[PDB]
Structure 1
């Protein structure tokens, strides 16, 4: 009824045309979305090997959906011990790193989940088409996540910006809702698991104290922490605030994996105007060593992160 019905493909296709493309991006994202519709539905009536299962089901629906587009060539998941090289007949120019169901086993309490993804391009003659083509996050060409909450959103970041598409469940199509979004300069909210982290935090500790009982003319920051990277980062895009998970134990700290949680998220944030830092290191410019390596991340509104860095500079 919406008849200049901007679907994702519609969008992704007219951007390709401008790049003097070949199609693979569009075929790919098309393939990506069918895994996302089926995953959205798997979840929307979930609770109707054995224990783990859902993340797996999804993992295997994203690998098989991405192989069939003749667009991918190396694929990396939380779930697989090492990269999977797409067979020669179905290869294409793209490298996809993704987390098929972040939050996965913690959805009984109906918490908003997600699939997160980063897309690279193979630039090399051949190696053949190897895992070593796992390189710094500022080389990403597309990145984003699919959120599964009250409604299902595919937030997508590319060279030209960040766009928000929501699944219309009545036509099984992702339609452009929010367009070319930017993040608020600063904003009333901070997010960090304030338990344990408090006994183990760095200069975070002070920024937190500062955001609770402020010194200069203020009113305190509201705290919020869902416990799903996709739920706490998307809110941060939507309202403006800060998100951080550095937690010191594990020193390749974090818990969140660089290639597929941190670098899509950071790419989005930066493309919408936020900054994402390790505190000392800037996350999209860290160059990886392992496909499964772990990174500290802090992301959100520019001003607020600037704030934690200025604290961090005159500390250790």
Structure 2
């Protein structure tokens, strides 16, 4: 149908009978994403190196400033939570709208020096309180998400987006400057053949994780072992899980007893995308989306992917937790 993300998002807003407020917020985020893609790809690098006679922190700050300014100037927001800011950012009264956005503007930027795929992750909620906006409006369960997505700056730039009717994939055509729809209503495989986690924490794994990893490598059913992949950049690993199937894990371990990854702006957004595509996303003890947030930078364990694989992991957890 609509070819471009811009038309697609407009048309979905029309079908939803929206007033245009979420459409503007979505357009704003996606413009920030284009601006980030351009910087990640190093447009203007020659000027930094003295072409006219004249780094990861800078790109983190820039990416964060793109997202904040684009979202605030949309007139659709009241509260923003960023991975880069300690406190919630309350939108000026004059520019205040309905929505709350939790985002990680440039996830993986610590490893930009090796040119690892990196990404931007976001989740959007409606403010449901009647009182003045505060960080509390950001502390909603992931079940309350109105829309969420991620951009992956990989070999090409892609956006995964859901507004509650499945997951759609769009790719940036840089010669045109627009995202183009490449797959509508993507569904994750019921069972995959890839497992994705940092095995350098094997020494610190719980009994469940140790058992599950052993069976990936040494199956007891006569099947071939699963392949391993782990980029170390969440968006890259989660996106491969979506398109190829299998499992991605960052469980609690002895040194990170609450996991590493952040509930509000990493794990909730990807849990929503993955469930929208027919997969599962769990902490090990409940769905990620059912965790009731206590603090805006809260960490949780994360296990997600193909439902048969996530079920297998959960079985290890229950078994090893039982008397």
TM-score by length of 2: 0.93
Q: Is the 8 A contact 1:9 1:29 kept in 2?
A: no
Give the alignment partner of residue 36 of structure 1, picking from 10, 33, 37.
33
2:305 to 297, 300, 310: 300
SS at match of 1:280: coil
CA distance in 2, matches of 1:249, 1:23: 47
Match of 1:86 in 2: 91
Retained in 2: the 8 A contact 1:279–1:298?
Answer: yes
1:7 maps to 4
2:270 corresponds to which of 242, 256, 265? 265
Structure 1 position 62 matched with structure 2 position 62: no
Asked if the contact 1:191/1:224 (under 8 Å) is kept, the reply is yes
Paired position in structure 2 for 1:314: 319
Deviation at 1:182, TM superposition (A): 0.5
**Equivalent pair of 2:246/2:309 in contact (CA under 8 Å):** yes
1:122-168 CA-to-partner distances (Å, cap 9, x unmatched) read: 1122x201211121001101011000011000100121110001111
Report the equivalent of 1:161. 166
Tell me what 2:150 maps to.
145
Residue 244 of structure 1 contacts residue 299 of structure 1 at CA under 8 Å; is this kept in 2?
yes
Q: Is the 8 A contact 2:271 2:280 kept in 1?
A: yes
Matched with 1:201 is 205
Question: Tell me, what secondary structure is at the counterpart of 1:314?
Answer: helix
The correspondence of residues 206-225 of structure 1 with structure 2, limited to 5 A, is 206-225=211-230
The CA deviation string for residues 83-114 of structure 1, in whole angstroms up to 9 with x for no partner, is 00101111111100000000002011111000
> What is the CA-CA distance between 1:246 and the residue it aligns to?
1.2
Kindly indicate whether the alpha-carbon contact (under 8 Å) linking 1:252 and 1:294 is maintained by their aligned counterparts in 2: no
Question: How many angstroms apart in 2 are the aligned matches of 1:247 and 1:86?
Answer: 34
State the shift of 1:64 in Å.
0.4
CA distance in 2, matches of 1:282, 1:159: 17
Q: Is the 8 A contact 1:116 1:264 kept in 2?
A: yes
Using the TM superposition, give the Cα deviation of residue 18 of structure 1 relative to its aligned residue in structure 2, in angstroms.
2.1
Q: Which residue pairs with 2:136 in the alignment?
A: 132
Instruction: Provide the aligned C-alpha RMSD in A.
Output: 1.3
Q: Distance in 2 between matches of 1:5 and 1:167?
A: 15
Structure 1 Cα separation of the partners of residues 2 and 156 of structure 2: 19
Provide the TM-score with structure 1 as the length reference.
0.95
**2:194 maps to which of 151, 170, 189:** 189
SS at match of 2:185: coil
3-state secondary structure, aligned to 1:106: helix
Moved over 2 A (4+): 249-252
CA distance in 1, matches of 2:39, 2:91: 26
- More deviation in 222-231 or 274-283? 274-283
Higher helix proportion (structure 1 or 2): 2
Deviation at 1:33, TM superposition (A): 1.3
Shift of 1:217: 2.0
Residue 249 of structure 1: CA displacement? 3.6
> Deviations for 1:245-276, whole angstroms, at most 9, x for unmatched residues?
01414555211100000000000000000101
C-alpha distance in 2, partners of 1:297/1:287? Answer: 15
CA distance in 1, matches of 2:62, 2:56: 12
Mapped contact 2:56–2:110 kept (Cα < 8 A): no
Q: Give distance in 1, aligned partners of 2:87 and 2:255.
A: 21
Q: CA deviation at 1:8?
A: 1.4
